[PDB]
Protein backbone atom coordinates (compact mmCIF):
# COMPACT_ATOMS: atom_id res chain seq x y z
CA UNK A 402 0.00 0.00 0.00
CA UNK A 403 2.99 2.35 0.26
CA UNK A 404 4.16 2.29 -3.37
CA UNK A 405 2.43 4.95 -5.49
CA UNK A 406 2.18 2.65 -8.51
CA UNK A 407 3.02 5.48 -10.89
CA UNK A 408 5.01 4.75 -13.97
CA UNK A 409 8.61 4.24 -13.14
CA UNK A 410 10.35 7.49 -12.90
CA UNK A 411 7.20 9.59 -12.28
CA UNK A 412 7.28 11.05 -8.80
CA UNK A 413 4.28 13.34 -8.18
CA UNK A 414 0.51 13.46 -8.24
CA UNK A 415 -1.70 16.47 -8.88
CA UNK A 416 -5.03 17.15 -7.21
CA UNK A 417 -7.36 18.31 -9.98
CA UNK A 418 -9.87 19.56 -7.44
CA UNK A 419 -13.45 19.56 -8.67
CA UNK A 420 -12.48 19.00 -12.30
CA UNK A 421 -14.88 17.19 -14.60
CA UNK A 422 -13.88 13.72 -15.82
CA UNK A 423 -13.74 14.71 -19.51
CA UNK A 424 -11.42 17.59 -18.70
CA UNK A 425 -9.10 15.38 -16.73
CA UNK A 426 -9.02 12.86 -19.58
CA UNK A 427 -8.07 15.61 -22.03
CA UNK A 428 -5.51 17.03 -19.58
CA UNK A 429 -3.82 13.65 -19.25
CA UNK A 430 -3.43 13.40 -23.01
CA UNK A 431 -2.41 16.96 -23.83
CA UNK A 432 -0.31 17.80 -20.74
CA UNK A 433 0.13 15.49 -17.79
CA UNK A 434 1.40 12.54 -19.78
CA UNK A 435 3.91 14.51 -21.81
CA UNK A 436 5.05 16.59 -18.83
CA UNK A 437 5.87 13.58 -16.66
CA UNK A 438 3.19 13.80 -13.98
CA UNK A 439 2.56 10.54 -12.18
CA UNK A 440 -1.12 10.77 -11.54
CA UNK A 441 -4.23 12.68 -10.59
CA UNK A 442 -6.15 12.79 -7.35
CA UNK A 443 -9.82 13.18 -8.30
CA UNK A 444 -12.73 14.54 -6.27
CA UNK A 445 -15.11 11.97 -4.77
CA UNK A 446 -16.75 10.13 -7.69
CA UNK A 447 -19.67 8.79 -5.70
CA UNK A 448 -23.13 10.36 -5.54
CA UNK A 449 -23.58 13.11 -3.00
CA UNK A 450 -26.40 15.17 -1.56
CA UNK A 451 -27.20 18.47 -3.23
CA UNK A 452 -26.69 21.41 -0.89
CA UNK A 453 -28.71 24.47 -1.80
CA UNK A 454 -27.88 26.65 1.22
CA UNK A 455 -25.27 27.82 0.39
CA UNK A 456 -25.60 27.11 -3.33
CA UNK A 457 -23.55 24.03 -4.36
CA UNK A 458 -20.53 24.39 -2.10
CA UNK A 459 -17.47 22.29 -2.79
CA UNK A 460 -18.07 20.42 0.38
CA UNK A 461 -21.34 18.84 -0.66
CA UNK A 462 -19.09 16.15 -2.23
CA UNK A 463 -18.09 14.99 1.27
CA UNK A 464 -21.73 14.02 1.96
CA UNK A 465 -22.31 10.68 0.24
CA UNK A 466 -25.77 9.29 -0.49
CA UNK A 467 -24.80 6.22 -2.52
CA UNK A 468 -21.78 4.63 -4.21
CA UNK A 469 -23.15 5.27 -7.74
CA UNK A 470 -20.53 7.01 -9.85
CA UNK A 471 -22.58 10.05 -10.71
CA UNK A 472 -21.56 13.54 -9.70
CA UNK A 473 -21.15 17.04 -11.05
CA UNK A 474 -17.84 15.79 -12.49
CA UNK A 475 -19.70 13.27 -14.66
CA UNK A 476 -21.33 9.87 -14.84
CA UNK A 477 -19.89 6.34 -14.79
CA UNK A 478 -19.23 6.23 -18.51
CA UNK A 479 -17.31 9.49 -18.34
CA UNK A 480 -15.38 8.27 -15.30
CA UNK A 481 -14.40 5.00 -17.01
CA UNK A 482 -13.37 6.93 -20.14
CA UNK A 483 -11.14 9.15 -18.02
CA UNK A 484 -9.47 6.30 -16.20
CA UNK A 485 -8.85 4.43 -19.50
CA UNK A 486 -7.46 7.49 -21.30
CA UNK A 487 -5.23 8.59 -18.45
CA UNK A 488 -3.80 5.12 -17.85
CA UNK A 489 -3.19 4.79 -21.58
CA UNK A 490 -0.76 7.73 -21.47
CA UNK A 491 0.85 6.62 -18.22
CA UNK A 492 -1.01 8.88 -15.79
CA UNK A 493 -2.66 7.14 -12.85
CA UNK A 494 -5.96 7.98 -11.13
CA UNK A 495 -6.29 8.11 -7.32
CA UNK A 496 -9.80 8.39 -5.85
CA UNK A 497 -10.86 10.44 -2.82
CA UNK A 498 -12.70 7.74 -0.88
CA UNK A 499 -15.39 9.11 1.44
CA UNK A 500 -16.07 6.10 3.59
CA UNK A 501 -16.35 7.27 7.23
CA UNK A 502 -19.82 8.69 6.83
CA UNK A 503 -22.86 9.43 4.72
CA UNK A 504 -24.54 12.84 4.56
CA UNK A 505 -25.50 15.31 7.26
CA UNK A 506 -27.76 13.86 9.93
CA UNK A 507 -29.95 16.97 9.77
CA UNK A 508 -30.52 16.79 6.00
CA UNK A 509 -33.97 16.53 4.45
CA UNK A 510 -35.34 13.37 2.87
CA UNK A 511 -35.86 13.12 -0.83
CA UNK A 512 -34.14 12.80 -4.21
CA UNK A 513 -32.09 16.07 -4.03
CA UNK A 514 -28.96 14.12 -4.90
CA UNK A 515 -26.54 14.13 -7.80
CA UNK A 516 -27.96 11.00 -9.44
CA UNK A 517 -31.51 11.23 -8.14
CA UNK A 518 -31.28 8.49 -5.56
CA UNK A 519 -33.55 8.67 -2.57
CA UNK A 520 -32.33 9.07 0.92
CA UNK A 521 -33.93 9.73 4.32
CA UNK A 522 -31.16 10.97 6.58
CA UNK A 523 -33.42 11.35 9.67
CA UNK A 524 -34.30 7.71 9.39
CA UNK A 525 -30.78 6.67 8.29
CA UNK A 526 -32.13 5.17 5.07
CA UNK A 527 -29.90 5.00 1.99
CA UNK A 528 -31.66 2.48 -0.18
CA UNK A 529 -29.32 2.88 -3.12
CA UNK A 530 -26.47 1.26 -1.16
CA UNK A 531 -28.37 -0.07 0.82
CA UNK A 532 -27.84 1.12 4.38
CA UNK A 533 -30.34 1.38 7.27
CA UNK A 534 -30.21 2.66 10.84
CA UNK A 535 -28.43 -0.59 11.83
CA UNK A 536 -25.39 0.42 9.82
CA UNK A 537 -24.57 3.64 11.74
CA UNK A 538 -22.87 4.41 15.10
CA UNK A 539 -25.51 6.42 16.99
CA UNK A 540 -25.64 3.87 19.85
CA UNK A 541 -21.86 3.43 20.18
CA UNK A 542 -21.28 7.18 20.58
CA UNK A 543 -21.19 8.25 24.22
CA UNK A 544 -21.49 12.02 23.94
CA UNK A 545 -24.73 13.80 24.83
CA UNK A 546 -24.89 15.59 21.52
CA UNK A 547 -23.92 12.66 19.29
CA UNK A 548 -21.08 14.71 17.90
CA UNK A 549 -17.39 15.04 18.63
CA UNK A 550 -17.03 17.26 21.66
CA UNK A 551 -13.36 16.64 22.44
CA UNK A 552 -10.49 15.63 20.18
CA UNK A 553 -8.70 14.51 23.35
CA UNK A 554 -10.93 11.36 23.46
CA UNK A 555 -10.10 8.97 20.61
CA UNK A 556 -13.36 7.06 21.11
CA UNK A 557 -15.45 10.04 20.36
CA UNK A 558 -13.34 11.12 17.39
CA UNK A 559 -13.98 7.72 15.81
CA UNK A 560 -17.48 6.78 16.98
CA UNK A 561 -19.33 10.17 16.98
CA UNK A 562 -20.42 12.39 14.18
CA UNK A 563 -17.88 14.60 12.48
CA UNK A 564 -19.68 17.96 11.86
CA UNK A 565 -23.02 16.19 12.06
CA UNK A 566 -22.30 13.63 9.36
CA UNK A 567 -23.90 10.21 9.84
CA UNK A 568 -21.10 7.98 11.09
CA UNK A 569 -20.95 4.52 9.48
CA UNK A 570 -20.59 1.49 11.71
CA UNK A 571 -17.18 0.48 10.34
CA UNK A 572 -16.93 -2.42 12.83
CA UNK A 573 -19.66 -4.29 10.96
CA UNK A 574 -18.66 -6.69 8.19
CA UNK A 575 -21.77 -5.60 6.26
CA UNK A 576 -20.56 -1.98 6.19
CA UNK A 577 -16.96 -2.94 5.50
CA UNK A 578 -18.20 -5.07 2.57
CA UNK A 579 -20.36 -2.30 1.11
CA UNK A 580 -17.32 -0.01 1.17
CA UNK A 581 -15.01 -2.65 -0.29
CA UNK A 582 -17.45 -3.38 -3.09
CA UNK A 583 -17.32 0.30 -4.07
CA UNK A 584 -13.55 0.50 -3.88
CA UNK A 585 -13.16 -2.78 -5.82
CA UNK A 586 -15.41 -1.51 -8.60
CA UNK A 587 -13.05 1.47 -8.89
CA UNK A 588 -9.94 -0.73 -8.84
CA UNK A 589 -11.34 -2.93 -11.59
CA UNK A 590 -12.11 0.18 -13.67
CA UNK A 591 -8.39 0.99 -13.41
CA UNK A 592 -7.83 3.30 -10.41
CA UNK A 593 -4.37 2.96 -8.83
CA UNK A 594 -5.24 3.89 -5.26
CA UNK A 595 -7.11 6.01 -2.76
CA UNK A 596 -7.02 8.99 -0.53
CA UNK A 597 -8.94 7.73 2.55
CA UNK A 598 -10.89 10.76 3.66
CA UNK A 599 -11.30 11.39 7.36
CA UNK A 600 -9.09 8.50 8.39
CA UNK A 601 -8.60 10.00 11.80
CA UNK A 602 -12.32 9.36 12.34
CA UNK A 603 -11.96 5.63 11.74
CA UNK A 604 -10.21 2.99 13.80
CA UNK A 605 -6.97 1.84 12.13
CA UNK A 606 -8.14 -1.77 12.35
CA UNK A 607 -11.45 -1.01 10.70
CA UNK A 608 -9.60 0.59 7.81
CA UNK A 609 -7.36 -2.48 7.69
CA UNK A 610 -10.38 -4.77 7.50
CA UNK A 611 -11.65 -2.87 4.49
CA UNK A 612 -8.26 -2.77 2.79
CA UNK A 613 -7.80 -6.51 3.21
CA UNK A 614 -10.81 -7.03 0.91
CA UNK A 615 -9.30 -5.06 -1.97
CA UNK A 616 -8.44 -6.39 -5.38
CA UNK A 617 -5.08 -6.20 -7.02
CA UNK A 618 -4.74 -3.47 -9.70
CA UNK A 619 -5.94 -4.04 -13.25
CA UNK A 620 -3.29 -5.89 -15.23
CA UNK A 621 -4.09 -4.03 -18.43
CA UNK A 622 -1.93 -1.28 -16.95
CA UNK A 623 -0.18 -2.67 -13.82
CA UNK A 624 2.06 -5.64 -13.07
CA UNK A 625 0.37 -8.67 -11.58
CA UNK A 626 0.16 -8.63 -7.82
CA UNK A 627 0.05 -4.84 -7.53
CA UNK A 628 -1.63 -3.47 -4.44
CA UNK A 629 -3.51 -0.16 -4.45
CA UNK A 630 -1.67 2.89 -3.16
CA UNK A 631 -3.22 4.06 0.10
CA UNK A 632 -2.79 7.49 1.63
CA UNK A 633 -4.84 8.23 4.72
CA UNK A 634 -5.96 11.72 5.64
CA UNK A 635 -4.98 12.16 9.28
CA UNK A 636 -4.38 15.66 10.59
CA UNK A 637 -1.79 15.42 13.33
CA UNK A 638 0.21 18.52 13.93
CA UNK A 639 1.87 17.10 17.04
CA UNK A 640 -0.36 18.17 19.92
CA UNK A 641 -3.46 15.93 19.96
CA UNK A 642 -4.13 12.40 21.15
CA UNK A 643 -4.41 10.57 17.85
CA UNK A 644 -1.09 10.04 16.17
CA UNK A 645 -0.34 9.53 12.49
CA UNK A 646 1.75 6.57 13.38
CA UNK A 647 -1.39 4.64 14.42
CA UNK A 648 -2.13 4.34 10.70
CA UNK A 649 1.25 3.28 9.31
CA UNK A 650 0.26 -0.37 9.04
CA UNK A 651 -2.37 0.50 6.42
CA UNK A 652 -0.48 2.72 4.01
CA UNK A 653 0.95 6.22 3.82
CA UNK A 654 -0.42 9.12 5.84
CA UNK A 655 -0.76 12.79 4.97
CA UNK A 656 1.95 14.76 6.78
CA UNK A 657 0.13 18.00 7.61
CA UNK A 658 3.12 19.19 9.64
CA UNK A 659 4.95 19.63 6.33
CA UNK A 660 3.03 22.51 4.82
CA UNK A 661 2.28 24.13 8.15
CA UNK A 662 5.96 24.35 9.11
CA UNK A 663 7.18 25.15 5.55
CA UNK A 664 4.63 27.98 5.22
CA UNK A 665 5.78 29.50 8.49
CA UNK A 666 9.41 29.25 7.43
CA UNK A 667 8.91 30.73 3.96
CA UNK A 668 6.81 33.56 5.39
CA UNK A 669 9.54 34.18 7.96
CA UNK A 670 6.98 34.10 10.76
CA UNK A 671 7.68 33.16 14.39
CA UNK A 672 11.39 33.77 13.97
CA UNK A 673 11.68 30.97 11.41
CA UNK A 674 14.39 31.04 8.76
CA UNK A 675 15.08 29.00 5.59
CA UNK A 676 18.51 28.11 6.93
CA UNK A 677 16.73 26.01 9.55
CA UNK A 678 15.61 23.64 6.78
CA UNK A 679 19.00 21.91 6.59
CA UNK A 680 17.59 18.95 8.58
CA UNK A 681 14.12 18.99 7.02
CA UNK A 682 12.24 15.71 7.23
CA UNK A 683 12.45 13.47 10.25
CA UNK A 684 14.76 16.09 11.85
CA UNK A 685 11.73 18.31 12.14
CA UNK A 686 9.83 15.50 13.90
CA UNK A 687 7.98 14.32 10.80
CA UNK A 688 6.92 10.76 10.08
CA UNK A 689 9.25 8.47 8.14
CA UNK A 690 9.69 9.57 4.56
CA UNK A 691 8.46 6.17 3.30
CA UNK A 692 5.16 6.71 5.07
CA UNK A 693 4.53 10.32 4.06
CA UNK A 694 2.33 12.02 1.50
CA UNK A 695 3.44 15.66 1.44
CA UNK A 696 2.04 18.84 0.00
CA UNK A 697 2.24 22.60 0.62
CA UNK A 698 -1.51 23.14 0.69
CA UNK A 699 -4.60 20.95 0.19
CA UNK A 700 -8.19 21.63 -0.78
CA UNK A 701 -9.23 22.20 2.87
CA UNK A 702 -6.45 24.37 4.21
CA UNK A 703 -6.05 26.63 1.18
CA UNK A 704 -9.43 28.03 2.21
CA UNK A 705 -9.09 27.82 5.98
CA UNK A 706 -10.78 24.44 6.52
CA UNK A 707 -8.90 21.51 8.20
CA UNK A 708 -5.52 22.56 9.72
CA UNK A 709 -2.40 24.81 9.26
CA UNK A 710 -4.11 28.19 9.47
CA UNK A 711 -2.88 31.36 7.92
CA UNK A 712 0.65 30.07 7.55
CA UNK A 713 -0.42 27.82 4.70
CA UNK A 714 0.86 29.08 1.38
CA UNK A 715 -1.46 28.97 -1.63
CA UNK A 716 -1.75 30.30 -5.16
CA UNK A 717 -2.98 33.56 -3.68
CA UNK A 718 0.58 34.10 -2.43
CA UNK A 719 2.06 33.04 -5.74
CA UNK A 720 5.65 34.18 -5.36
CA UNK A 721 6.23 32.51 -1.98
CA UNK A 722 4.08 29.55 -2.99
CA UNK A 723 6.35 28.80 -5.94
CA UNK A 724 9.35 28.88 -3.58
CA UNK A 725 7.71 26.46 -1.15
CA UNK A 726 6.52 24.08 -3.88
CA UNK A 727 9.99 24.21 -5.43
CA UNK A 728 11.68 23.36 -2.16
CA UNK A 729 9.29 20.48 -1.67
CA UNK A 730 9.74 19.08 -5.16
CA UNK A 731 13.53 19.28 -4.90
CA UNK A 732 13.82 17.73 -1.39
CA UNK A 733 13.85 13.91 -1.21
CA UNK A 734 11.40 13.64 1.76
CA UNK A 735 8.00 12.14 1.03
CA UNK A 736 5.80 11.43 -1.95
CA UNK A 737 4.71 14.78 -3.37
CA UNK A 738 1.24 16.03 -4.24
CA UNK A 739 0.74 19.35 -6.02
CA UNK A 740 -2.53 21.22 -5.75
CA UNK A 741 -4.52 22.52 -8.68
CA UNK A 742 -7.20 25.01 -7.73
CA UNK A 743 -9.93 27.38 -8.75
CA UNK A 744 -10.38 31.01 -7.85
CA UNK A 745 -13.14 32.25 -5.62
CA UNK A 746 -14.11 35.56 -4.11
CA UNK A 747 -12.54 35.62 -0.68
CA UNK A 748 -14.21 37.78 1.94
CA UNK A 749 -12.37 38.02 5.20
CA UNK A 750 -14.34 39.08 8.24
CA UNK A 751 -12.29 39.22 11.39
CA UNK A 752 -9.77 36.84 9.75
CA UNK A 753 -12.38 34.32 8.55
CA UNK A 754 -13.18 33.87 4.85
CA UNK A 755 -17.00 33.79 4.92
CA UNK A 756 -16.88 32.74 1.28
CA UNK A 757 -14.85 29.56 2.03
CA UNK A 758 -17.80 27.44 0.81
CA UNK A 759 -17.79 28.60 -2.84
CA UNK A 760 -17.77 25.69 -5.24
CA UNK A 761 -15.97 25.29 -8.56
CA UNK A 762 -16.49 27.56 -11.53
CA UNK A 763 -19.98 26.97 -12.76
CA UNK A 764 -22.82 28.15 -14.80
CA UNK A 765 -25.89 27.80 -12.62
CA UNK A 766 -24.42 24.82 -10.81
CA UNK A 767 -23.02 23.15 -13.91
CA UNK A 768 -19.22 22.95 -13.64
CA UNK A 769 -17.38 24.86 -16.33
CA UNK A 770 -14.96 23.20 -18.69
CA UNK A 771 -11.24 23.94 -18.34
CA UNK A 772 -10.26 26.05 -21.29
CA UNK A 773 -6.60 26.23 -22.33
CA UNK A 774 -5.11 29.50 -23.53
CA UNK A 775 -2.44 29.93 -26.14
CA UNK A 776 0.08 30.75 -23.37
CA UNK A 777 -0.79 27.42 -21.69
CA UNK A 778 -2.70 29.05 -18.82
CA UNK A 779 -6.32 28.15 -18.13
CA UNK A 780 -9.51 30.10 -18.40
CA UNK A 781 -12.87 30.04 -16.55
CA UNK A 782 -11.20 30.73 -13.16
CA UNK A 783 -9.26 27.46 -12.98
CA UNK A 784 -5.86 28.44 -11.61
CA UNK A 785 -3.94 25.47 -13.01
CA UNK A 786 -0.89 25.84 -10.80
CA UNK A 787 0.38 22.56 -12.25
CA UNK A 788 0.76 24.49 -15.56
CA UNK A 789 2.92 27.26 -14.04
CA UNK A 790 6.40 26.89 -15.58
CA UNK A 791 8.03 27.06 -12.14
CA UNK A 792 5.96 24.16 -10.83
CA UNK A 793 5.86 21.97 -14.02
CA UNK A 794 9.61 22.22 -14.38
CA UNK A 795 10.09 21.26 -10.74
CA UNK A 796 7.81 18.23 -11.25
CA UNK A 797 10.28 17.27 -14.03
CA UNK A 798 13.28 18.06 -11.75
CA UNK A 799 11.98 15.59 -9.15
CA UNK A 800 11.75 12.83 -11.80
CA UNK A 801 15.27 13.65 -13.10
CA UNK A 802 16.83 13.44 -9.63
CA UNK A 803 14.85 10.43 -8.34
CA UNK A 804 16.99 8.20 -6.17
CA UNK A 805 19.80 10.76 -5.68
CA UNK A 806 20.66 11.77 -2.15
CA UNK A 807 20.40 15.13 -0.46
CA UNK A 808 23.83 16.76 -0.91
CA UNK A 809 25.83 19.96 -0.95
CA UNK A 810 23.73 21.98 1.47
CA UNK A 811 24.72 25.62 1.86
CA UNK A 812 23.18 28.50 3.76
CA UNK A 813 24.02 32.12 4.68
CA UNK A 814 22.81 31.71 8.30
CA UNK A 815 19.59 33.54 7.35
CA UNK A 816 17.22 32.86 4.41
CA UNK A 817 19.59 32.03 1.54
CA UNK A 818 19.94 28.29 1.07
CA UNK A 819 20.92 25.76 -1.56
CA UNK A 820 21.20 22.01 -1.96
CA UNK A 821 21.52 19.32 -4.53
CA UNK A 822 20.42 15.80 -5.37
CA UNK A 823 23.52 13.72 -5.95
CA UNK A 824 25.09 14.71 -9.28
CA UNK A 825 21.78 15.29 -11.05
CA UNK A 826 20.24 18.55 -9.76
CA UNK A 827 20.79 21.65 -7.70
CA UNK A 828 18.54 24.40 -6.39
CA UNK A 829 19.27 27.81 -4.83
CA UNK A 830 16.91 30.14 -2.94
CA UNK A 831 17.08 33.75 -1.86
CA UNK A 832 14.39 34.55 0.70
CA UNK A 833 16.33 37.37 2.38
CA UNK A 834 15.73 41.08 1.85
CA UNK A 835 19.09 41.55 0.13
CA UNK A 836 21.11 40.21 -2.79
CA UNK A 837 22.34 36.65 -3.15
CA UNK A 838 25.68 36.59 -5.01
CA UNK A 839 27.67 33.45 -4.11
CA UNK A 840 29.77 30.79 -5.80
CA UNK A 841 28.49 27.41 -4.68
CA UNK A 842 29.37 23.76 -5.11
CA UNK A 843 26.53 22.23 -7.14
CA UNK A 844 27.68 18.61 -7.28
CA UNK A 845 27.00 18.68 -11.05
CA UNK A 846 29.31 17.99 -13.99
CA UNK A 847 30.73 21.08 -15.60
CA UNK A 848 28.78 22.63 -18.38
CA UNK A 849 26.08 25.17 -19.12
CA UNK A 850 22.65 24.51 -17.66
CA UNK A 851 19.27 26.12 -18.27
CA UNK A 852 17.58 27.51 -15.14
CA UNK A 853 14.23 25.74 -15.32
CA UNK A 854 12.51 28.32 -13.09
CA UNK A 855 12.99 31.24 -15.45
CA UNK A 856 12.89 29.26 -18.71
CA UNK A 857 13.33 26.05 -20.61
CA UNK A 858 15.93 24.22 -22.68
CA UNK A 859 14.73 24.53 -26.24
CA UNK A 860 16.94 22.54 -28.55
CA UNK A 861 20.45 24.09 -28.41
CA UNK A 862 19.60 26.99 -26.11
CA UNK A 863 18.00 28.29 -22.91
CA UNK A 864 15.01 30.65 -22.94
CA UNK A 865 15.84 32.10 -19.55
CA UNK A 866 18.80 32.30 -17.19
CA UNK A 867 21.88 30.16 -17.93
CA UNK A 868 24.18 28.75 -15.23
CA UNK A 869 27.81 28.01 -16.10
CA UNK A 870 29.17 25.24 -13.89
CA UNK A 871 32.97 24.98 -13.70
CA UNK A 872 34.90 21.75 -14.09
CA UNK A 873 35.10 21.59 -10.28
CA UNK A 874 31.26 21.77 -10.02
CA UNK A 875 31.02 25.33 -8.79
CA UNK A 876 28.85 28.11 -10.14
CA UNK A 877 27.86 31.65 -9.31
CA UNK A 878 24.23 32.31 -8.43
CA UNK A 879 23.07 35.91 -8.49
CA UNK A 880 19.49 36.41 -7.31
CA UNK A 881 18.08 39.75 -6.33
CA UNK A 882 15.55 39.97 -3.54
CA UNK A 883 13.38 41.85 -6.04
CA UNK A 884 13.41 38.95 -8.50
CA UNK A 885 10.03 37.72 -9.72
CA UNK A 886 11.05 34.20 -8.74
CA UNK A 887 13.99 34.32 -6.31
CA UNK A 888 15.22 30.77 -6.87
CA UNK A 889 17.14 28.93 -9.55
CA UNK A 890 17.08 25.20 -10.34
CA UNK A 891 19.27 23.23 -12.76
CA UNK A 892 19.43 19.51 -13.51
CA UNK A 893 20.93 16.90 -15.75
CA UNK A 894 18.31 17.20 -18.46
CA UNK A 895 18.58 21.03 -18.57
CA UNK A 896 22.28 20.87 -19.54
CA UNK A 897 23.15 22.17 -22.98
Ligand SMILES: C[C@H]1O[C@H](O[C@H]2[C@H](O)[C@@H](O)[C@@H](O)O[C@@H]2CO)[C@H](O)[C@@H](O)[C@@H]1N[C@H]1C=C(CO)[C@@H](O[C@H]2O[C@H](CO)[C@@H](O[C@H]3O[C@H](C)[C@@H](N[C@H]4C=C(CO)[C@@H](O)[C@H](O)[C@H]4O)[C@H](O)[C@H]3O)[C@H](O)[C@H]2O)[C@H](O)[C@H]1O
Nearest residue numbers: 460461463464505506507508564565599601636706707708
Ligand atom coordinates in the same frame (compact mmCIF):
# COMPACT_ATOMS: atom_id res chain seq x y z
C1 LIG B 1 -12.14 19.33 7.41
C2 LIG B 1 -11.37 18.36 8.30
O1 LIG B 1 -12.01 18.35 9.62
C3 LIG B 1 -11.35 17.60 10.64
O2 LIG B 1 -10.12 18.17 10.97
C4 LIG B 1 -9.95 18.70 12.29
C5 LIG B 1 -8.61 18.13 12.80
O3 LIG B 1 -8.87 16.75 12.71
C6 LIG B 1 -8.26 18.69 14.16
O4 LIG B 1 -6.98 18.19 14.60
C7 LIG B 1 -8.26 20.22 14.06
O5 LIG B 1 -7.23 20.61 13.15
O6 LIG B 1 -9.51 20.68 13.50
C8 LIG B 1 -9.73 20.20 12.16
C9 LIG B 1 -10.97 20.87 11.57
O7 LIG B 1 -12.04 20.71 12.50
C10 LIG B 1 -11.18 16.15 10.14
O8 LIG B 1 -10.31 15.43 11.02
C11 LIG B 1 -10.61 16.04 8.71
O9 LIG B 1 -10.84 14.69 8.26
C12 LIG B 1 -11.30 16.95 7.70
N1 LIG B 1 -10.96 16.78 6.26
C13 LIG B 1 -11.68 15.67 5.44
C14 LIG B 1 -13.10 15.45 6.03
C15 LIG B 1 -14.26 15.97 5.59
C16 LIG B 1 -15.50 15.10 5.72
O10 LIG B 1 -15.64 14.32 4.54
C17 LIG B 1 -14.39 17.16 4.66
O11 LIG B 1 -15.15 18.22 5.35
C18 LIG B 1 -15.78 19.11 4.50
O12 LIG B 1 -17.10 18.65 4.15
C19 LIG B 1 -18.06 18.70 5.23
C20 LIG B 1 -19.31 18.00 4.77
O13 LIG B 1 -19.97 18.64 3.73
C21 LIG B 1 -18.24 20.17 5.56
O14 LIG B 1 -19.30 20.28 6.52
C22 LIG B 1 -20.52 20.87 6.06
O15 LIG B 1 -21.62 20.00 6.26
C23 LIG B 1 -21.90 19.58 7.60
C24 LIG B 1 -23.09 18.60 7.56
C25 LIG B 1 -22.18 20.86 8.42
N2 LIG B 1 -22.62 20.59 9.81
C26 LIG B 1 -23.98 21.14 10.15
C27 LIG B 1 -24.97 20.01 9.86
C28 LIG B 1 -25.50 19.14 10.74
C29 LIG B 1 -26.65 18.21 10.36
O16 LIG B 1 -26.72 17.98 8.95
C30 LIG B 1 -25.41 19.53 12.24
O17 LIG B 1 -25.66 18.36 13.04
C31 LIG B 1 -24.03 20.16 12.46
O18 LIG B 1 -23.76 20.45 13.82
C32 LIG B 1 -23.95 21.45 11.63
O19 LIG B 1 -22.75 22.17 11.92
C33 LIG B 1 -21.00 21.84 8.34
O20 LIG B 1 -21.28 23.08 9.00
C34 LIG B 1 -20.75 22.16 6.88
O21 LIG B 1 -19.62 23.03 6.78
C35 LIG B 1 -16.93 20.68 6.14
O22 LIG B 1 -17.10 22.03 6.50
C36 LIG B 1 -15.85 20.52 5.08
O23 LIG B 1 -14.58 20.83 5.61
C37 LIG B 1 -12.97 17.57 4.23
O24 LIG B 1 -13.02 18.30 3.01
C38 LIG B 1 -12.08 16.31 4.09
O25 LIG B 1 -10.76 16.61 3.58
Ligand SMILES: *[C@H]1O[C@H](CO)[C@@H](O[C@H]2O[C@H](CO)[C@@H](O)[C@H](O)[C@H]2O)[C@H](O)[C@H]1O
Nearest residue numbers: 639662672673674677680684685686687
Ligand atom coordinates in the same frame (compact mmCIF):
# COMPACT_ATOMS: atom_id res chain seq x y z
C1 LIG C 1 14.68 25.20 14.01
O1 LIG C 1 14.90 23.85 13.64
C2 LIG C 1 13.97 22.96 14.32
C3 LIG C 1 14.31 21.58 13.71
O2 LIG C 1 15.71 21.57 14.02
C4 LIG C 1 12.49 23.30 14.17
O3 LIG C 1 11.89 22.39 15.12
C5 LIG C 1 11.16 21.30 14.59
O4 LIG C 1 11.62 20.05 15.06
C6 LIG C 1 11.15 19.58 16.33
C7 LIG C 1 11.53 18.09 16.37
O5 LIG C 1 10.78 17.41 17.37
C8 LIG C 1 9.66 19.85 16.59
O6 LIG C 1 9.43 19.62 18.00
C9 LIG C 1 9.32 21.31 16.27
O7 LIG C 1 7.95 21.65 16.48
C10 LIG C 1 9.67 21.52 14.81
O8 LIG C 1 9.46 22.87 14.42
C11 LIG C 1 12.25 24.70 14.70
O9 LIG C 1 10.91 25.19 14.57
C12 LIG C 1 13.23 25.60 13.94
O10 LIG C 1 13.06 26.81 14.63
Ligand SMILES: [Ca+2]
Nearest residue numbers: 559560568602
Ligand atom coordinates in the same frame (compact mmCIF):
# COMPACT_ATOMS: atom_id res chain seq x y z
CA1 LIG D 1 -16.25 7.39 12.44
Ligand SMILES: [Cl-]
Nearest residue numbers: 570571572573
Ligand atom coordinates in the same frame (compact mmCIF):
# COMPACT_ATOMS: atom_id res chain seq x y z
CL1 LIG E 1 -18.68 0.68 14.35
Ligand SMILES: [Cl-]
Nearest residue numbers: 604605606607
Ligand atom coordinates in the same frame (compact mmCIF):
# COMPACT_ATOMS: atom_id res chain seq x y z
CL1 LIG F 1 -7.76 -0.06 15.84
Ligand SMILES: [Cl-]
Nearest residue numbers: 617625626627
Ligand atom coordinates in the same frame (compact mmCIF):
# COMPACT_ATOMS: atom_id res chain seq x y z
CL1 LIG G 1 -3.00 -9.78 -10.16
Ligand SMILES: [Cl-]
Nearest residue numbers: 596634655699
Ligand atom coordinates in the same frame (compact mmCIF):
# COMPACT_ATOMS: atom_id res chain seq x y z
CL1 LIG H 1 -5.52 15.43 2.03
